[PDB]
Structures are given as C-alpha cells and as structure tokens.
C-alpha cells in the first residue's frame, strides 16, 4: 500500500552554445504528471496527466517559478563542479537531481529521497535517516560540509515529511480513478522452432500497471534461471507496460516448461503451459 | 509540489 512522488531534473551544459539544456519531470508512482523543457516554447510547467490539469493558475505559476529556479541551480552546479574537478571549459557535462517522498499503507510519511549525480555517477545523497549525507569524494565532501553548515537536511526533511506527502495525498485522491487502479497483465505464450534441435518458448505479459512484475520459467518444477532471456520492462505508450521472458527448449519437450507471472494485480500468480 | 528552496552544490 505504498505510494511515491518523485521529481527528476537533468541539466546538460552546452559549452559555446548558450545556456544548459534543462528537463524536469514529476512522477506519482509510475505515472508522469508534469514536465518542463528549457527549449520548449511555453517556458512553463505543463501537465501530463488529467488529474493534475484541474489545478489552478496559482499551482502552475508556482511550479513554473520553482522549476525555473531549479534550472538556475543546476546551471550554476555545472560551473561549480567543473571547478571542483578542474575540468576544461569545452566539455559537455551533466548534473541530475532526484528527490521525493513515499507514504505507506496508512497514508502517513514512510521514506524520503534526495540525491545528485555528476556525469552519470553518484555525487551526494541523503541517507535513510534524513539527517546525514553520503559524500563519495573530496568534491562531495565540500558540498556535504556546506549543506551541514546551512542545516539543509533539516529544511529538506521538513519538506519531505510535510509539503511533499501532503500534496502526494492530494494527487492520489484527485487521481484516485487512475493512480489507485491495478491493471493485471494479459498473458499468453508463443512458440518458434529455431531448429529440430530446439525451439523457442516466449512468455508475454502485456497491458499491466504498475511496472513492477516478475516472470520466471520452470522446467519440471525447478527454476530455469539460465538459458532464459529476460527483456527489460518497456512502456506500451498508453500508460501500461510490457515484458516477455523467452527460453530455448529441445523439440518435443515444450510441455515440460512452465511460465510463472507475478504481479500485484493478480490475486494468485499465473501458471502458463504450452500443453 | 516541488521544494521551494534553492539548493546549490
């Protein structure tokens, strides 16, 4: 019964080509609901889900001012980190921020997250206790001491347990019809003989939400972890997700294998046989 | 809602 709200920020420096590229997105669970693109014409925080469109002009003015402020922050962070690491002014670098909060089954605050990354590597992260930081190197130690000086973990824990969860609850009740739904996966199998030596069984799971799913193959009850291909859970484009798991089988033994699908939308895990 | 604070690295 856990629910989450996340904000993702990506800033990429374009040296000698103007300002950095800034893109922000907000998620509730696996549903995107806001976006902002530095290069878009609107220069505004835009809706990407119906249940957020009902918010008033104060909300969108506010989130636009804040997201532009985070755009400025990351712009400065690119120059700052370039200094920390003594890097040339000609290379293009990337700062990424991610922060949000989780509420539990009782709809109270459960967990908080807030962390940065430079060029795809961890820079600094807020620890689970929401009171201390994790610094990977000298540069991150600098930031850590700066934030420790300004009591950042205090203001941030106050936000994560306050405004963050309050409006996560508001979004969950406004988007009750879609955010609190559960689309169970539609499943089936396919068989493609790659030879007389062996054939390919493929187990399909389609149109399911949320994206958390588990697919396993079994040969006579034992787990076929090896000889099993597993594809990455991909988006369908309509708000649902897809995933398939394939296994190679000697011809004539297709009835010996079994696909087991596990998803929170199913009351009992599914068992699929080629018999 | 986003966090109000400006937080620099």
């Amino acid at each position: 019964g856990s629910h989450s709200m996340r904000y993702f920020y990506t800033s990429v420096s374009r040296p000698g080509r103007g300002e950095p590229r800034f893109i922000a997105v907000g998620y509730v669970d696996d549903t995107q609901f806001v976006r902002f693109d530095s290069d878009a014409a609107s220069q505004r925080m835009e809706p990407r889900a119906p249940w957020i469109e009902q918010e008033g002009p104060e909300y969108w003015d506010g989130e636009t001012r804040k997201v532009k402020a985070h755009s400025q922050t990351h712009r400065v962070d690119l120059g700052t980190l370039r200094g920390y690491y003594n890097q040339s002014e000609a290379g293009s670098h990337t700062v990424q921020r991610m922060y949000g909060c989780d509420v539990g089954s009782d709809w109270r605050f459960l967990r908080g997250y807030h962390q940065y990354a430079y060029d795809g590597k961890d820079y600094i992260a807020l620890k689970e206790d929401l009171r201390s930081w994790t610094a990977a190197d000298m540069a991150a130690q600098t930031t850590k001491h700066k934030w420790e000086a300004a009591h950042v973990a205090e203001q941030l824990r106050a936000y994560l347990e306050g405004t963050c969860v309050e409006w996560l609850r508001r979004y969950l009740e406004n988007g009750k019809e879609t955010l609190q739904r559960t689309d169970a996966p539609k499943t089936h199998m396919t068989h493609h003989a790659v030879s007389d030596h062996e054939a390919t069984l493929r187990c399909w799971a389609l149109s399911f939400y949320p994206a958390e799913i588990t697919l396993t193959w079994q040969r006579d009850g034992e787990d076929q972890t090896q000889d099993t291909e597993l594809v990455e859970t991909r988006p369908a484009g309509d708000g649902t997700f897809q995933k398939w798991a394939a296994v190679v089988v000697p011809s004539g033994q297709e009835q010996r294998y079994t696909c087991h699908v596990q998803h929170e939308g199913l009351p009992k895990p599914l068992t699929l046989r080629w018999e | 809602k986003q966090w109000l604070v400006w937080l620099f690295l």
């Epitope: 402020a69 400065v76 205090e154 203001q155 | 604070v5 400006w6 620099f8």
Partner: antibody, heavy 105, light 116 residues
C-alpha cells in the same frame, strides 16, 4: 500581503513594545522577516523566521498568521521604521506598510 | 575590510536627459545581487535581481529607460538613459549569499534627484 496595523507607536525608554504583523497567503511554504530602517536609510535585518521552525523576539502564530516583533528594554537607538516582510514561490520580498517606532527617553 | 554592500555615488544631482550610472559592489562571498528603489508614495520597489550574474527577475524594471547589468560576481550597474524627474528616489543595492530566500544585506543607497 503583509499587514502592520498601527502605522506608528510610542514607547517609554526601558519598557517593552510589541509591533504586530499579519500576512495573507495560500502558498504552503514561505518566509517571514522583520527589517529595521533608521533615519540613516540603512536597511538592517532584525529577525528572520522560516515557516518550518537579544531584546528582540517574535510571537510566531502559524494558526492566526501572526508575526509580531517584541522589543524588551527599549534603547534610544531602536527608534526607526520597522518593516514586516514575507516571501514565497515568487522569490521577492513583499513589504508591509511599515511601523514607525518612537522612543521617549 | 570595513565593508558590506557598497554603492556609488552616495548622491547624484543631475538634469533631465542626462545619463545616470549607479554602481554596486556586493559583499565578497555573495552570489545574489538586488536592485531596489525607495520613495515616499510607492515605498520599496524591487527593480531587478541577479543570481550568479544571471538576471533572474526584471519585472520591476521600467521599460527602455532602465537597464541593469552584472559582468562580474563582484560588480553590478544600473543605468537610466535618459533620466527624468519621476526617477527621483533612493536606489538601494542589496546582496545575499546564495539565493533570494537568504537574508539580504542592503547598501547605504544612492540618493538620486533628477531636476527639471
């Protein structure tokens, strides 16, 4: 908007005076400030208070939206124009009308 | 250093049509710079404020008569060209360490009187 009800106040030296200030905003995270401007025109901060948390102190009532400045043991050097300020997602100081504090020796 | 926010000139008396240049050097480690002006009728008015030399908000700036710039982290300038009597005011420069939410420290101000 910030409201400082009485635009002027007189207090006897070595006595305590309380300047009222109330604001009105829907936004859920904000900042409050008390600034002081003597006749020298030099704006100086007196007290800062964030929403989540000397002779000068403040009664901060989040319920009634009250941010009152309290000066105990008035000193002649406190006579000045006291402004109550407030900031939200607009990231711009929003100024009250101001209260002129006069200290009678 | 004996220093906070620094403004020059302290006073400026000039005639209309003349160019007016106000200079400000913020506190050393401060990255946000603010331009205010104060009058009797209108009170305090935020004209423009920068952060890390980037102009964040200039909505308080009048149009095509006022222009502010900040070429260094340690210097900003506000220019009125041409000046008019209605510009008469006390233009304050302020600064803060990192963001507009941080305590702002104000300068002594420039007393501008544009006469007819």
């Amino acid at each position: 908007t910030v409201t400082q009800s009485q635009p002027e106040m007189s207090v006897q030296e070595a006595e305590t005076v309380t300047l009222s200030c109330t604001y009105d905003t829907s936004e859920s995270d904000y900042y409050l400030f008390w600034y002081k401007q003597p006749p020298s025109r030099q704006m100086i901060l007196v007290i800062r208070q964030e929403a989540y948390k000397n002779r000068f102190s403040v009664n901060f009532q989040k319920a009634a939206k009250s941010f009152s400045l309290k000066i105990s043991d008035s000193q002649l050097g406190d006579a000045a124009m006291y402004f109550c300020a407030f900031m939200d997602s607009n990231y711009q100081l929003i100024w009250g009308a101001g209260t002129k504090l006069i200290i009678k020796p | 250093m004996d220093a906070g926010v620094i403004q020059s000139p302290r006073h400026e008396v000039t005639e209309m049509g003349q160019e007016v240049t106000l200079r400000c050097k913020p506190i050393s480690g401060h990255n946000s710079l603010f331009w205010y002006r104060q009058t009797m009728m209108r009170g305090l008015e935020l004209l423009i404020y920068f952060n890390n030399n980037v102009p964040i908000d200039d909505s308080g700036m009048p149009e095509d008569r006022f222009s502010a710039k900040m070429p260094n982290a340690s210097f900003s300038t506000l220019k009125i060209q041409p000046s008019e009597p209605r510009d008469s005011a006390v233009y304050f420069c302020a600064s803060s360490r990192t963001s507009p939410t941080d305590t702002q420290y104000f300068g002594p101000g420039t007393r501008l009187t544009v006469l007819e």
